[PDB]
Design an enzyme around this catalytic site. Sequence first.
Site, PDB file in Angstrom:
ATOM      1  N   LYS B  82       0.866  -1.215   0.000  1.00 57.23           N
ATOM      2  CA  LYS B  82       0.000   0.000   0.000  1.00 57.23           C
ATOM      3  C   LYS B  82       0.891   1.251   0.000  1.00 57.23           C
ATOM      4  O   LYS B  82       0.491   2.262  -0.606  1.00 57.23           O
ATOM      5  CB  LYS B  82      -0.954   0.052   1.200  1.00 57.23           C
ATOM      6  CG  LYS B  82      -1.910  -1.124   1.373  1.00 57.23           C
ATOM      7  CD  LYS B  82      -3.102  -1.136   0.423  1.00 57.23           C
ATOM      8  CE  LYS B  82      -4.396  -1.649   1.068  1.00 57.23           C
ATOM      9  NZ  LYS B  82      -4.169  -2.850   1.881  1.00 57.23           N
ATOM     10  N   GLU B 104     -10.045   7.212   3.393  1.00 57.73           N
ATOM     11  CA  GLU B 104     -10.965   6.309   4.126  1.00 57.73           C
ATOM     12  C   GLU B 104     -10.173   5.054   4.495  1.00 57.73           C
ATOM     13  O   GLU B 104      -9.434   4.535   3.634  1.00 57.73           O
ATOM     14  CB  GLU B 104     -12.230   5.982   3.321  1.00 57.73           C
ATOM     15  CG  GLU B 104     -12.059   5.958   1.804  1.00 57.73           C
ATOM     16  CD  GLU B 104     -11.425   4.700   1.223  1.00 57.73           C
ATOM     17  OE1 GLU B 104     -10.372   4.828   0.531  1.00 57.73           O
ATOM     18  OE2 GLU B 104     -11.989   3.597   1.438  1.00 57.73           O
ATOM     19  N   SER B 371       2.013  -9.728  -0.396  1.00 56.74           N
ATOM     20  CA  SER B 371       1.577  -8.312  -0.381  1.00 56.74           C
ATOM     21  C   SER B 371       1.864  -7.663   0.972  1.00 56.74           C
ATOM     22  O   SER B 371       1.936  -6.428   1.008  1.00 56.74           O
ATOM     23  CB  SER B 371       0.118  -8.211  -0.737  1.00 56.74           C
ATOM     24  OG  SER B 371      -0.671  -9.019   0.126  1.00 56.74           O
TER      25      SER B 371
HETATM   26  N1  LIG Z   1      -6.423  -1.691   4.280  1.00 58.60           N
HETATM   27  C1  LIG Z   1      -7.325  -0.786   3.521  1.00 58.60           C
HETATM   28  C2  LIG Z   1      -7.924  -1.518   2.310  1.00 58.60           C
HETATM   29  C3  LIG Z   1      -8.631  -0.634   1.327  1.00 58.60           C
HETATM   30  C4  LIG Z   1      -8.714   0.729   1.350  1.00 58.60           C
HETATM   31  N2  LIG Z   1      -9.442   1.179   0.279  1.00 58.60           N
HETATM   32  C5  LIG Z   1      -9.834   0.109  -0.479  1.00 58.60           C
HETATM   33  C6  LIG Z   1     -10.585   0.064  -1.651  1.00 58.60           C
HETATM   34  C7  LIG Z   1     -10.835  -1.177  -2.192  1.00 58.60           C
HETATM   35  C8  LIG Z   1     -10.356  -2.344  -1.594  1.00 58.60           C
HETATM   36  C9  LIG Z   1      -9.606  -2.300  -0.440  1.00 58.60           C
HETATM   37  C10 LIG Z   1      -9.333  -1.056   0.142  1.00 58.60           C
HETATM   38  C11 LIG Z   1      -8.392  -0.238   4.472  1.00 58.60           C
HETATM   39  O1  LIG Z   1      -8.072   0.629   5.275  1.00 58.60           O
HETATM   40  O2  LIG Z   1      -9.556  -0.645   4.466  1.00 58.60           O
END
Ligand SMILES: N[C@@H](Cc1c[nH]c2ccccc12)C(=O)O
Lengths: 385, 385
Positions: B82, B104, B371
Amino acid sequence: MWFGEFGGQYVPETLVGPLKELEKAYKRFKDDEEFNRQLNYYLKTWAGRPTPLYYAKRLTEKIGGAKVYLKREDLVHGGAHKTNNAIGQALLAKLMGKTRLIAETGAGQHGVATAMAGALLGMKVDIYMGAEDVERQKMNVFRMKLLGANVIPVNSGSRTLKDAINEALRDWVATFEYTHYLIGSVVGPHPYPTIVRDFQSVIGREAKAQILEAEGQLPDVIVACVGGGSNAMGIFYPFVNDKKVKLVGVEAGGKGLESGKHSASLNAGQVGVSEGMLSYFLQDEEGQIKPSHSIAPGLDYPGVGPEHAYLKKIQRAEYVAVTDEEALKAFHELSRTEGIIPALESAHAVAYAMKLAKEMSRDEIIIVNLSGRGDKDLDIVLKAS
Amino acid sequence: MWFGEFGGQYVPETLVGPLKELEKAYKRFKDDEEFNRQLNYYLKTWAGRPTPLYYAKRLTEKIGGAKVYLKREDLVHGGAHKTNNAIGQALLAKLMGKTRLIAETGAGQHGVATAMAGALLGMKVDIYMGAEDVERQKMNVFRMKLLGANVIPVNSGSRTLKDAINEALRDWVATFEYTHYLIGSVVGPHPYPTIVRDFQSVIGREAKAQILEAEGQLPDVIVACVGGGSNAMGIFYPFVNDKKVKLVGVEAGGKGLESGKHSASLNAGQVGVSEGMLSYFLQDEEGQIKPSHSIAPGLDYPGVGPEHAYLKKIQRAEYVAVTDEEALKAFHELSRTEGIIPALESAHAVAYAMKLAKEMSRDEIIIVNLSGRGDKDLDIVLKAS
Ligand SMILES: N[C@@H](Cc1c[nH]c2ccccc12)C(=O)O
Ligand code: NA
Ligand code: NA
C-alpha cells in the site's frame, strides 16, 4: 578472546570444550567461499539487505545543524538488526552438523529472530522463557509457536531470564554435539562477542558505501544505542580505522543516572566477571550485580560488551546516556517528522543525534543506527502517555 | 477511462471538476523526469525498494512440483505494498500544490500508509474512519496519531467504512483546491484505477528483472490475492504482453462460494455501477449491493477494480477463490516452513500457489505476490486457533 583487558572464557570447564569446538568451526567457515555465498544469499533474498541510508531533510531543517542520515535496520525481515546475527549463527550451526538451536529471551525479540532463522534453515528451535515473561509477552510467544519453535516455560526459581539462562546453559552442556546456543548480543564467553560483531558489521560496510555514494565523504559522527552493543559494534567496526569518524554509543539513562534505575554500565558500572566475560557491569556498594532499568526492554541489561569497554578505555568511542522521557520525545518526533516509528531502543540513539546535530555545522554529517521499528513498543508508549 | 466495457466516471457533476483537475495534473507529472527521480528516491531510501524475490526452497521441496518464488512486498516500509501508492499520490498532490491528504480506512492499513506518506512529505493528513472501526483498531488509530495524522472518527449512519467514504467525498468536493483524496486500491472513478496501478506496477518491473537474473526466463504463473486488485495489477501489468505468463488472481472464497459469505466479485458477481465505476459487484435477487465476507480484512470488499473485469473478459487473467480455512493453513505452513509470517490477504495467494505447484513440473516457476506481513493479523488467527 581479548579486547584489551576485557573478554575471555570465564565459564566452568564443562562449557570450555564446546566453545573451543565453536571457535575451531567459526575459523574454518568465517572466510569459506560457500558459507559466505549462502549467508549473503539469505541476507539478500530473505532478510532484504541491503537496507537503505535515509536523509532526514525535515528533521535536519527543524534542528538547523548537521545533516542527519538514518541507517534503516527497521526494514530488515523481523524489524530489527537481530536478524543478521540469527541467520549467521543458525547457518554456521547447520554447516557444523547441528540439528537444533536454543536461545533465551524475556522480551521475546531474540527468540522470534532465533525462531525465524531456525524455520528458514529447517532446524528444531527450543526457546527457554521464564513463566513470568511468558504471561507478559503472549504475542511473541504466539509468533514463536507460529514459526514452529517450542517455548519451554521455566517454573523453576524466580521464573525469569536468570533461571532461563541457567536451564539453557544446562541443556547446551549436554546437547552441544547436535545443539547450538544462539547468543543475542556481543556478550558472554569467547568466541560469541567476536562472531556476533562479525555478523552485524554488514550494517557499517553498507553505511560506508552509502554515505560515500550520498555525500562523497565519510560521516563526522556515527550514533548507535547500546544494550549489549551488537548494533553499535555492527555500525562502528568498519569505521574503526577512520580516525576522523567519532563513534558515540547511547546507553539507557532510565529515570536518571543519580536515581539508580538505569542500564548505563560504561558510565556508572564497575569491572567484574559475570555470564562468561570480563567487562563493565552495574553493582551496588557490596560486590553484588544490581538490577538495570530502561523503558526500552532491549537496553535493559546490567552488562555491556567487552569490545565497547575496550573502545571506551582507548578513547576511540565516547559513551553517553539518554533519559526515558528524552527517548519518548524522539520516538514521537521521528514518527511525526519522518513517518518512521522507531524502536524505543533506537529512540535513545535518535534523541542524542538531535542534540549533537544542533551544535555541529550544516556541512557535517551524522549517521544514526535505526536498530528496529517500534510496532513492538506501541503498548509501552501508550501507557507512558 | 475504460478498460474495454468496464471503468468510467459515475459521479455527480460536483466531482467531475476535481477528477478532471487530477487527470490533467497526472498527465503532466506521470512522465516528468523530476517527479520520477523524487518518487524512485523515496521508494529506495524511505520504503526500502527494491524488495527481494525469495526462492522458497523448503516449501517447494515439500510440495514436490514447481519452484515457488515470493515477491517480498512484506519487507516494504509499513509492511504492505500500500506504501508504494501512498508515496506516489502524496508526492503527486504536493507537486500539484495540495497541502492536505484525506483517506478512508476500515482495517486501518490504508490509513497508516496515508499517514506515513503524509509525515514523509510534510502534508496535513485527516483520515476518515468509522467510530465502530476506531474501537476495534486501537493500535492503527494510535499509529496514525503518532504519525501526525488526525483520525476523524465518523459517528453518523452505521459508524462503518461506507459512512466515512461519503463524509470524505463531502470533504473533498469543498477542499479539493488544497486537498487530494488518496484512494488505496484500483477502484473508484477515473483516473484512480489507472493512477493506483501505475504506482504499483513497480512490483512487476522489479519481479521481471529479478526472476530473469535468478532463473534466466519469465515465470510460468504469477499468483496475487485480489481485494480491489492494486497489488495484483501491480505485479500483473508488466507481464500482460508476455503471452505465455499465466496470471491468477485469488479473491476471498470466505466460508465458501456456495455459502454466499465471500468477496469473490469476479466469480459470483454481476456487472453494474457502484463507488463511481462499472465493474463486477456482489448482488442479491434485487440487484442491490450484497455484504462481503473474508477472514482477511483487506480482501473483504464486495467489488473489484475495472481492469480485473477487463483481464477476465479477454481471458488474459484467471480468477479463483480460496476459503478462510485454506488461507489459515497457508498462514501457518509458510511461517513454519520459510519463517515468513504473511498477511491473511497474501496467505490466500500462497494457499492457491501451493495447490497449483503440486500439479506442475519441478522445472516450472511460480511467483507469488506476498503483499504484506502478518503482525497485524495475529489476534484473528489466535481466535481462529
Ligand atoms: N487496508 C485498507 C484496504 C482498502 C482501502 N481502500 C480500499 C478500496 C478497495 C479495496 C480495499 C481497500 C483499508 O483501510 O480498508
Ligand atoms: Na547496559
Ligand atoms: Na473483491
